[PDB]
Amino acid sequence: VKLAGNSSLCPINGWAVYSKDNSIRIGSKGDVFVIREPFISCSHLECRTFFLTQGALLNDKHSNGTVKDRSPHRTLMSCPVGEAPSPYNSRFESVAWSASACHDGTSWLTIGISGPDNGAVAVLKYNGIITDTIKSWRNNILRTQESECACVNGSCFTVMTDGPSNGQASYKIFKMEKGKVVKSVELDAPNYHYEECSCYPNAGEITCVCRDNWHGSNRPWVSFNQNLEYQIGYICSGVFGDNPRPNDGTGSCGPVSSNGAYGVKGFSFKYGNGVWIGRTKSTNSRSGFEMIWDPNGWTETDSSFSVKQDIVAITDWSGYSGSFVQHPELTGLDCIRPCFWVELIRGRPKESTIWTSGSSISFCGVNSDTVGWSWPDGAELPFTI
Amino acid sequence: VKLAGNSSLCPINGWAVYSKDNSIRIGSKGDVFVIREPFISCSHLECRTFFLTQGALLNDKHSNGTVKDRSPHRTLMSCPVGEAPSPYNSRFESVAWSASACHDGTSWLTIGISGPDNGAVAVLKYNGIITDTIKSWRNNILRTQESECACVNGSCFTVMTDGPSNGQASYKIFKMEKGKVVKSVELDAPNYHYEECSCYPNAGEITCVCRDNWHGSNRPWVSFNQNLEYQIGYICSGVFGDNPRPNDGTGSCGPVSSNGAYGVKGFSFKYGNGVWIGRTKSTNSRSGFEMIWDPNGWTETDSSFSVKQDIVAITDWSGYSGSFVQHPELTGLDCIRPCFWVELIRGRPKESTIWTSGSSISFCGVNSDTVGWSWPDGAELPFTI
Amino acid sequence: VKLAGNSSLCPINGWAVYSKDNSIRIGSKGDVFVIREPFISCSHLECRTFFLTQGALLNDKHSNGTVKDRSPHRTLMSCPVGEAPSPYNSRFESVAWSASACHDGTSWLTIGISGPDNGAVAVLKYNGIITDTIKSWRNNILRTQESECACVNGSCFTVMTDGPSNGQASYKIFKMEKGKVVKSVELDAPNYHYEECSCYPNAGEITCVCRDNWHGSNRPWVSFNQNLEYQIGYICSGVFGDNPRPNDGTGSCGPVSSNGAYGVKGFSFKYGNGVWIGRTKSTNSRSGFEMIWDPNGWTETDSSFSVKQDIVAITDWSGYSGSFVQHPELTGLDCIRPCFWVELIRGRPKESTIWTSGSSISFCGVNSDTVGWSWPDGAELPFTI
Amino acid sequence: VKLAGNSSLCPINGWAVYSKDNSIRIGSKGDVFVIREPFISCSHLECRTFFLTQGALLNDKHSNGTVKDRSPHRTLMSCPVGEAPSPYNSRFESVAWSASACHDGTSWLTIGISGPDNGAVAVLKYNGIITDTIKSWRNNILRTQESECACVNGSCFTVMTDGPSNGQASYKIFKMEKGKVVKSVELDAPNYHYEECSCYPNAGEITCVCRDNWHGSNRPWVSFNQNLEYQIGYICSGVFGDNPRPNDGTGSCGPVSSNGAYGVKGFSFKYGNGVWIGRTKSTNSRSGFEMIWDPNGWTETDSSFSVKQDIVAITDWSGYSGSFVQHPELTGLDCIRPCFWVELIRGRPKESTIWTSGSSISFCGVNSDTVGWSWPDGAELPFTI
Ligand SMILES: CC(=O)N[C@@H]1[C@@H](O)[C@H](O)[C@@H](CO)O[C@@H]1O
Ligand SMILES: CC(=O)N[C@@H]1[C@@H](O)[C@H](O)[C@@H](CO)O[C@@H]1O
Ligand SMILES: CC(=O)N[C@@H]1[C@@H](O)[C@H](O)[C@@H](CO)O[C@@H]1O
Ligand SMILES: CC(=O)N[C@@H]1[C@@H](O)[C@H](O)[C@@H](CO)O[C@@H]1O
Ligand SMILES: [Ca+2]
Numbered sequence A, B, C, D: 001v002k003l004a005g006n007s008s009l010c011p012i013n014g015w016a017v018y019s020k021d022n023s024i025r026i027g028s029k030g031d032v033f034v035i036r037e038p039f040i041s042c043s044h045l046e047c048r049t050f051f052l053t054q055g056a057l058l059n060d061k062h063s064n065g066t067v068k069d070r071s072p073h074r075t076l077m078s079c080p081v082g083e084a085p086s087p088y089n090s091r092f093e094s095v096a097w098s099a100s101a102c103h104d105g106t107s108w109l110t111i112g113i114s115g116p117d118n119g120a121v122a123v124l125k126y127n128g129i130i131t132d133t134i135k136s137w138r139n140n141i142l143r144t145q146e147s148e149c150a151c152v153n154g155s156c157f158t159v160m161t162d163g164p165s166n167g168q169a170s171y172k173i174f175k176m177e178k179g180k181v182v183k184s185v186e187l188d189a190p191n192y193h194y195e196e197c198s199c200y201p202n203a204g205e206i207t208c209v210c211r212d213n214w215h216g217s218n219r220p221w222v223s224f225n226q227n228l229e230y231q232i233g234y235i236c237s238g239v240f241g242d243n244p245r246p247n248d249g250t251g252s253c254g255p256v257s258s259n260g261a262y263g264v265k266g267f268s269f270k271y272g273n274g275v276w277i278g279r280t281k282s283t284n285s286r287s288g289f290e291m292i293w294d295p296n297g298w299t300e301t302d303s304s305f306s307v308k309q310d311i312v313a314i315t316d317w318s319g320y321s322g323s324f325v326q327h328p329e330l331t332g333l334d335c336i337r338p339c340f341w342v343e344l345i346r347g348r349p350k351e352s353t354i355w356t357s358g359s360s361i362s363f364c365g366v367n368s369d370t371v372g373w374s375w376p377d378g379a380e381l382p383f384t385i
């Protein structure tokens, strides 16, 4: 029975820890995959962790990592939430150096992109069998979310980008049914830059908060209905959500240029004019993480917000983060449960090792209260190398 | 279908070996988690061993163990009984440094407590999805059972402690349905001290024999009805159950102070006025283990009992032990099966190693006869380190 | 639906290979249990390999093997047929240094013996839960089949021995239903010696070919109805089946004392007056294996037989062997499939290693034809040690 | 419900990546089987990777490989597609040094050949239980496909060969149901040579594109109906598909002798008079791979074709490749999905190592457009040895 996306986000006060895989600590001896972007996505029965791997295990020579980010060995795989990804427990999803995934209430939809930079192809799979294809339309590194896609009333949506990771690029939203694209639309976003979008359904519509790797310190967003009729803009809060970024000053609803000329995948949940912002604690490195609730901060510009909940000390490494959802058909709740995951990146380029891999941690909405704390990776580098 | 807890503990005469994981022996080479408090809990279909892990494998540097007991890397996980807990056969349960779990006949309820000592929070998960949250009400290490919680007529119950592990602390019994706290009561237990309670259902009510880490060599207990109406006391048997403890002399129904100023998690099963006491054979170390049947020693003070069933020789290490239940809905029986598990702790602080982990063995009630013997851990220390 | 054992053994011409786990070759690097007696047993849906482990992995110091055969670390476990027994793939079954197991059509019945030699206790489990217990009645190493038990019309049977492995011992046949002994009978077998019995159903009755470790080179047997009414004797074929044994001269239906005062677990399939004798190729060592069809040789004394099919070359090591069956309820056949497994023992006492473990291979009945050959263990010794 | 193979091959324009196991790369540290011929086969619910192993793991001395190709340790096993084959995730299928498998909609049929060269026997298993047997009829290495068999209307078909690998051999087509050979036919193919066939169903009939190891650079084919009434020939295209082979010159519908005196397992898909030829890129080595679409080329002789899609660069090792099928019962399509898998061989005889093993990559039909690229094995040799 297809997943209805007609309810709204559950109201929340804080975030309770949901999972921690300690994959890097475990990989020190155990056969664990060296991964990146471990995004979580759920069905009507379970939540799994998808990730991308170079096809190498920690503490092995094949984790050398000097390899191009987009190699032909990069594959999309998944394993149950909270477990360390290893060949002994991970399911194979797709060959990909960029992907996204989601369940529509019936079967899983996975999107893996592979191929050369000048003509990559997104392979759509529905319940493990290829159902469609999408070719780069700008021949300049087709890429997608690196996090969960959003499904509503039996249709799922994703956002792909094609073009330079600097200046203007091309951006399209896709709507698929049973893994088949039934409609796509190019965004008319001059001066915007979308990458690695974290999307989620809310009252039958989708909202995506993404990464402006071109010239913005704030995060850009797109929200659209089931017919790809959309709207775009930026989070106006002076509580800049990208990394790097400048100290929290006055923002704008259009790309803040001051230091936002690069970035990190991230997310944000919208509630009225308010926004739950997930971000690193450092303005220069992917270190630490914290959840900030800036009411009237999605449409306004301030430096003021009401709540700050710590997740990773500034003293420890963090990395990509993304939103994932829990539907009422899984929860029994009468609303959509917002949750998020954080990638704790270890190794290069910040540490003196020959590899790069990340652990994951995740938290969910919740009405009751929580506590801020630090749940870092905890691995002692360097490894036996 | 919900687990009815209306029947009574089956009448027994001894304890038969149920399981032995040989985790440490296996971990010398295998990818086994370094664990603590491996408690067992069953559903209406299977039994699992839950445990807490620092997220490190045996024989790996990350097992350094100098780390604080309550680290953000501690996670609650579970695997099938008798199996060595590895990242390849364990399911992720919750992030926690203290926890409990039980099945109501429908889904698993897990309780993982994590966060800072002055504001730790217990996350409750029904079927893997956060269903409620509990905050430290004393801001001094909210902690729980470290063993199975007890369910009855669709409601599960647990005991939590907050406050000093020395003098008076606070104790609350919680009643939850579908992982949600519907009622809670704070025990008016002046001069009592409760920790790591081992609870079990019996004729529609719950009984917990716990650990008095403040000032008792004997074990305190609490039994309550489904409405949290309770009674409290101490096992009065001169066969003292805690460790450390004095030589078996004359007991009492209120904290025996001679030597009882510390402790170890344990259990005891009440039968009329008698008691089946599980305990270490040594009075100073967590070494050895034996079952003692003191008929009518739950209310009377003696040193005499009638049956002693050896489990682990004084020459071998033991540790935490807890009780776990088999419901008629799993057994087909017309009574509830009292069973117990013993943690065989190896390493620090008693052994010259850099780590500390434990193996498990479990036994079950039974009418037919048994035999005493010694089922120690069996690992040759130290390891490759 | 209970397994009906009313059909007879399927007629056969030879034996086709069914499986080979290569556990020892794989154990060189993999995490394989060091094991003994990997007997096979099937349900109405699958076949599993059961085995006993000291709880150590190959190539690990804990596989030291100088330990007493019956240690408190020996555990009964199973994994799918053909797979290497590892803690990552094996299911825990019971704590035991001696055991048997069989499925009745509904659930598995496992029997594990543990405890001291002067009072070992067999714990019977049905679907993982203890359903009965049997104590030693001679207080001298209670032991059982070390292979599959036989179930018929919803009742399972097994044979246990208690007493010396030299002279006269005591033997009993047990009948259980849902893991509970409903009837037992002590065999009045003066001058007989039964050990490690290989039993199987045939037309509603059980026939067991065992090991006479006291004073017989030929194998003794017992057959009984569902009410434990029995018959006993020895295979009279001059083609002696035990090991050690003398060269095939003239047998008798009463213990051949020439060279058979020790032994090895083996099996045999009776067809009318004929016999399919499985046995080692050497008369002094557990080396090589072969299947021999001596028609009119279960009741007669000769040296002549009509067929010899090679399984393991005299040049390679063999060991325990046992029968297992495949019921029509699993097969679709209108008869019971006779099959057998062979333990390929490597290490001590015949090799200069510090351990002892075995691989397994199995074969099944079959109308079509087969071929003789050699399916040896294949591991290179010694190991890294 | 039995797989109906009455529909035809789906029309296609290119091939989309389906999987990549990275087994060898992962095998540097992880416990991965050293394998060969990892052919893929699907049921009505999942797709699996079958493969032959010497019962050894990468980077372990037992991978020494100087062992005969046909050893008694070789076993046919299978794990899920895209997963590295390890003893922790692979299912045992059969003892075999030559094999094939396919699902008929109800259960899996596996065929594993074992035994000596002068009398090998093929064991057929339907749902894991032996259902038939086939003896060598020429006593000269009875061998089979090493890829998926084809099922249609409840009957599966395979092609086996017995006799020399040089001159004339004997070729037989077997029709089996529920794993029992209901009919067979020896091909009357003078001057033909069939080995390692890649068969597939289409409109109720089977077509196989095999390997001529005797005297052909082009591939021989056989197509038959469900009554084993067949036709034979060679692909006439001057785009020679075998390896070794000559530069694409002029083909013939009869063995192209020149340079065609050896070979490699391969496949091809026929569409009218056209062919989708998969082949290595090199003409002397098993390196590189590409898919070529030569319309009107199955019946014609040319050097011209319209499409070439790279899969593996000439600078990277390839190996065996074969075809596997999707059926409309697993896909929901109204046609049969043609797919293929390529074996990436690393080690001997081309590389300075002691072992030989292969990784796998797979692609499927697809109407949408794809991209040619290079998805090589990616391991860094030599290994720790
Ligand atoms: C520890 C290790 O293997 N590091 C090597 C490094 O020495 C070498 O310079 C580099 C270039 O290929 O590859 C890896 O980084
Ligand atoms: C063998 C080993 O790795 N032990 C180290 C030890 O040398 C060091 O003093 C301690 C302090 O962090 O950490 C670990 O215990
Ligand atoms: C390689 C190894 O550790 N072998 C030891 C051996 O040296 C020692 O004499 C014996 C005593 O228990 O134990 C093991 O056999
Ligand atoms: C690295 C290694 O151990 N290789 C050995 C090689 O030295 C030996 O000559 C050969 C003969 O069996 O076996 C293995 O290939
Ligand atoms: Ca930016």
Ligand SMILES: [Ca+2]
Residues within 6 Å of the ligand: B212, B213, B214, B215, B216, B217, B218, B242, B243, B244, B259, B260, B261, B262, B263, B264
């Ligand atoms: Ca105490």
Ligand SMILES: [Ca+2]
Residues within 6 Å of the ligand: C212, C213, C214, C215, C216, C217, C242, C243, C244, C259, C260, C261, C262, C263, C264
């Ligand atoms: Ca004997």
Ligand SMILES: [Ca+2]
Residues within 6 Å of the ligand: D212, D213, D214, D215, D216, D217, D242, D243, D244, D259, D260, D261, D262, D263, D264
């Ligand atoms: Ca050729």
